[PDB]
Ligand binder design. Structure first.
Ligand SMILES: [Mg+2]
Ligand SMILES: [Mg+2]
Ligand SMILES: [Mg+2]
Ligand SMILES: [Mg+2]
Ligand SMILES: [Mg+2]
Ligand SMILES: [Mg+2]
Ligand SMILES: [Mg+2]
Ligand SMILES: [Mg+2]
Ligand SMILES: [Mg+2]
Ligand SMILES: [Mg+2]
Ligand SMILES: [Mg+2]
Ligand SMILES: [Mg+2]
Lengths: 226, 205, 156
RNA sequence: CGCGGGGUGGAGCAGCCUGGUAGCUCGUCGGGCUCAUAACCCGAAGAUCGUCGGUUCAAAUCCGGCCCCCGCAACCA
RNA sequence: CGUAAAGCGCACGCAGGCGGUUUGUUAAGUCAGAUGUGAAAUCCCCGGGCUCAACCUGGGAACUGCAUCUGAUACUGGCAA
């Protein structure tokens, strides 16, 4: 809903990477350097975060599908909880190159997963040999990790919320290709060029990602309540 | 200095009625209009860009019965004039005396109209004019001289003209056999299957 | 309503261990004759498959050109790799006096009057890219005035 | 039979002219939606373009045959 | 003009080319106007005469130049600080 400088500063949003890894494009949002580490200017974070929240709310009210993309070890479970609890979709394992631009092929895999999953419930993996009941079970496990968050999406989304613009550059680029706006939490070592709603701030602390996700999940929840 | 070969052959090569016959019958009843002439006629000619430009130019030349040297002079004159080069070129071709006498209807075809002009049956503004290419000016009066006012070919040609779209820019009377060229026709009044830009482009290569 | 045109088909080879693998490339341009034009380059083992891939690719990734009554706004220059391309607005009736690839792209984009001249390598792929880049880097009085904070009459 | 027109998911319609793309509306299945239905939303399924042929790298499109449909067509004591 | 042809082996330096900023002045370059001249024909525009056309012809435009006179002083040049 609403966040403030104290909450961001308690969760450690102002901390950035070390100076020798920064992006010169990220200079405007940089406050200073302390002990060879950049410090992110929260006076820029707060209005940008609130402005991104407003745009996300408007999309949610118009029944837009939101794809929560975050795949680092520090934000995988965080992004899964936020998207389940906001009734939207997510990716929290390795992003498949071409999820969006190659949606036709990726969709065939979605159909395969649904059929395999229903067969498991029915009991189909009993007539076949034990090996065929472990192979298919292993296939279902892999397909769940990869496309288990977008099996019900059914189409190209209307916005992406990428936790790490650095790590998830492929997803951002596919979004830019298709036409889908990106809301991205962007650290000091990252490139904000492909992002439409930049949100400067630390993207590696579990506390910070939980902060961003709770606020974003509440906004989408309230916008669908409408 | 005039094409004397078969007429429907040109219409088949262009794949379009060139009005080279009077119109007593249908061109599909007189020839195989859908098939190009010659041994390899049924084949579908895949035409290059230079080919389409050349075929367009040849279509216009064969409609009006104008050879290449004179036609090139027309383009030069049209390009020199002010306005639009393609529309000017069509205007000159329409101003030829053979075309005018055909359009008012003292001739089944443009070949028949041309023979009348040549054989001194036509008068513009009261004077016998023998020159086919003679450019008629606005407000001119074209008449059939008294000596030739008897010809059955003229009578039947007038009847056939009643069966075609009557040009809006000339004023004809079939009782006196005299027409008035009021104004120069526009691109709205001419058949839009012509593509003049191809001719302009062709002559600009 | 989209007019399409195949500019060039070209046979290439790969020279695999067994010998030469011949495949085909097709360059096509599509446009709505009213300011939108795109180009598509497709490869395949057969000519129909190649042109089909190119046409589909070209229907996507189209762009919008600010056309002035079937003519250009002002003289433009386009450059891609070794191909330079000069284009100039002309007066109604001139026609499209352009080169080989430029002819197809301009006709399909709706330019009816232009004076064009390619300087440099006349490779069709690079020529098409340069002419489309020139048509895209061309601005109209409305956007120029908006950029400069004036009215169109102020800019004339 | 004569002349003209027509045939595209179950239904109703574009696409044909300029040869490269099966679109629009309803309907069907499944889900959400609704306590449920309805309304709404999202998917999923559904045509080989009447058929037989030719044209041509390529045909719903261009050409012909057959099939049907429709209008007109001169004939009822 | 790195590798396709193409940076002298390197430097100093006369002639030459180019010249930070301010004021004043001059008016050379520059610009504006005016005048003289730039033969006629030819090219171009609007007309006219040969039945049309080629051709001939009336008027105009043009001849992008040069010279002189009168002005402007932004910039370049000169001179002065
Ligand atoms: Mg001769
Ligand atoms: Mg060269
Ligand atoms: Mg060498
Ligand atoms: Mg060398
Ligand atoms: Mg050296
Ligand atoms: Mg030196
Ligand atoms: Mg100086
Ligand atoms: Mg002076
Ligand atoms: Mg003279
Ligand atoms: Mg005269
Ligand atoms: Mg004269
Ligand atoms: Mg000075």
């Amino acid at each position: 809903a609403t966040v403030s400088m104290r909450d961001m500063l308690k969760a450690g949003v102002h901390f950035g990477h070390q100076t020798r890894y920064w992006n010169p494009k990220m200079k405007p949002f940089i406050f200073g350097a302390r002990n060879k580490v950049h410090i992110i200017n929260l006076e820029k974070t707060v209005p940008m975060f609130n402005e991104a929240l407003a745009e996300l709310n408007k999309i949610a009210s118009r029944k837009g599908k939101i794809l929560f993309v975050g795949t680092k070890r520090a934000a995988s479970e965080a992004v899964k909880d936020a998207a389940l609890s906001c009734d939207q979709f997510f990716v929290n394992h390795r992003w498949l190159g071409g999820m969006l631009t190659n949606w036709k092929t990726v969709r065939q895999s979605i159909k395969r997963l649904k059929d395999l999953e229903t067969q498991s419930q029915d009991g189909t993996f009993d007539k076949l040999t034990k090996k065929e009941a472990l192979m298919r079970t292993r296939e279902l496990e892999k397909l769940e990790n990869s496309l288990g968050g977008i099996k019900d999406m059914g189409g190209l989304p209307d916005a992406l919320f990428v936790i790490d613009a650095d790590h998830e550059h492929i997803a951002i680029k596919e979004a830019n290709n298709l036409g889908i706006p990106v809301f991205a939490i962007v650290d000091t070592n990252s490139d904000p060029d492909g992002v439409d709603f930049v949100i400067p701030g630390n993207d590696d602390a579990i506390r910070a990602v939980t902060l961003y996700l709770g606020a974003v999940a509440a906004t989408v929840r309230e916008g669908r309540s409408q | 200095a005039r094409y004397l070969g078969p007429k429907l052959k040109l219409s088949r090569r262009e794949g379009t009625d060139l009005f080279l016959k009077s119109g007593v019958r249908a061109i599909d009843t007189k020839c195989k209009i859908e098939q190009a002439p010659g041994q390899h006629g049924a084949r579908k000619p895949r035409l290059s860009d230079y080919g389409v430009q050349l075929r367009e130019k040849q279509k216009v030349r064969r409609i009006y019965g104008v050879l290449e040297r004179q036609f090139r002079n027309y383009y030069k004159e049209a390009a020199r004039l002010k306005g639009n080069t393609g529309e000017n070129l069509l205007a000159l071709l329409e101003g030829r005396l053979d075309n005018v006498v055909y359009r008012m209807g003292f001739g089944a075809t443009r070949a028949e109209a041309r023979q009348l002009v040549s054989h001194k049956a036509i008068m513009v503004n009261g004077r016998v004019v023998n020159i086919a290419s003679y450019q008629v000016s606005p407000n001119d009066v074209v008449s059939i001289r008294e000596k030739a006012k008897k010809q059955s070919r003229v009578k039947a040609a007038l009847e056939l003209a009643e069966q075609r779209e009557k040009p809006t820019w000339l004023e004809v009377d079939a009782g006196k056999m005299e027409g008035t060229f009021k104004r120069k026709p526009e691109r709205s009044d001419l058949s839009a299957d012509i593509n003049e830009h191809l001719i302009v482009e062709l002559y600009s290569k | 309503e989209l007019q399409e045109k195949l500019i060039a088909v070209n046979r290439v080879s790969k020279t695999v261990k067994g010998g030469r693998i011949f495949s085909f490339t097709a360059l096509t341009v599509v446009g709505d004759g009213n300011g939108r034009v795109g180009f598509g380059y497709g490869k395949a083992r057969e000519v129909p498959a190649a042109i089909q891939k190119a046409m589909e690719k070209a229907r996507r990734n189209m762009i919008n050109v600010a056309l002035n009554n079937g003519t250009l706004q002002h003289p433009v220059k386009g450059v891609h790799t070794g191909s330079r391309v000069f284009m100039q607005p002309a007066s109604e009736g001139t026609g499209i006096i352009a080169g080989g690839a430029m002819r197809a792209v301009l006709e399909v984009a709706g330019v009816h009057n232009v004076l064009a001249k390619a300087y440099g390598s006349t490779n069709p792929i690079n020529v098409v890219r340069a002419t489309i880049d020139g048509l895209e880097n061309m601005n109209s009085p409305e956007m120029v005035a908006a950029k400069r904070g004036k009215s169109v009459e102020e800019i004339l």
